[PDB]
Design a protein around this ligand. Structure first.
Ligand SMILES: NC(=O)c1ccc[n+]([C@@H]2O[C@H](COP(=O)([O-])OP(=O)(O)OC[C@H]3O[C@@H](n4cnc5c(N)ncnc54)[C@H](OP(=O)(O)O)[C@@H]3O)[C@@H](O)[C@H]2O)c1
Ligand SMILES: COc1cc(Cc2cnc(N)nc2N)c2c(c1OC)O[C@@H](C1CC1)C=C2
Length: 157
């Protein structure tokens, strides 16, 4: 199983200066829950953003750099290597990966952040004409989680 994992705002911003533009613990708990015991694929920039392997799952980092050999982390140098990986594979970011994989994944788990932020990286445009809403569940707003947000599970029609 090949899935995208992404959080994006109303204009499909995903990134600003190699960080997330928003602070939203719920989303991060969601990511954790979904991908425990499974595999994350991710481009070098996103990994260096996170700065160390994510515990309790297989971290795979896609890079052109053949000197890459980080403890905790498996490296690949081709998009095609993704299809070799066993198990549930989540495409974890960032923009380059999403663009490369979006026509290939079986489904997407998306957090829509119901705000407009300044970004420098984006999720590719997509149509619900192409993608069916298997579930839509509103994040809960609270002291700690203060932007409206919706958990979409979409599956390719
Ligand atoms: N909202 C979210 O859910 C979310 C999730 C993840 C990331 N982000 C954001 O996304 C932004 C980063 O996106 P980005 O596109 O700039 O970076 P990125 O996708 O994380 O990484 C790009 C790098 O990945 C490697 N790569 C990609 N495709 C490759 C290929 N086909 N073959 C070999 N290597 C390949 C290359 O590394 P090398 O140059 O080393 O070869 C490339 O420079 C950040 O702002 C981050 O905060 C948001
Ligand atoms: C740009 O830096 C980060 C990028 C991601 C990828 C990501 C985040 N949220 C969602 N809904 N999907 C993702 N693929 C995550 C992240 C980042 O920095 C912290 O935190 C992780 C932490 C919660 C485990 C979760 C995903």
């Amino acid at each position: 199983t090949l899935s995208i994992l992404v959080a994006h705002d109303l204009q499909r911003v995903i990134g600003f200066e190699n960080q997330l533009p928003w602070h939203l613990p719920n989303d991060l708990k969601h990511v954790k829950k979904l991908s425990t015991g499974h595999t994350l694929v991710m481009g070098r920039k996103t990994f260096e953003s996170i700065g160390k392997p994510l515990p309790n799952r297989r971290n795979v980092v896609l890079t052109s750099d053949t000197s890459f050999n980080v403890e905790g982390v498996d490296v690949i140098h081709s998009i095609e290597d993704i299809y070799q990986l066993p198990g549930h594979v989540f495409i974890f970011g960032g923009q380059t990966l999403y663009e490369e994989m979006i026509d290939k994944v079986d489904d997407m788990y998306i957090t829509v952040i119901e705000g407009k932020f300044r970004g420098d990286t984006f999720f590719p445009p997509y149509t619900f004409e192409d993608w069916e809403v298997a579930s839509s569940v509103e994040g809960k707003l609270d002291e700690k989680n203060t932007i409206p947000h919706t958990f979409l599970h979409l599956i390719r029609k």
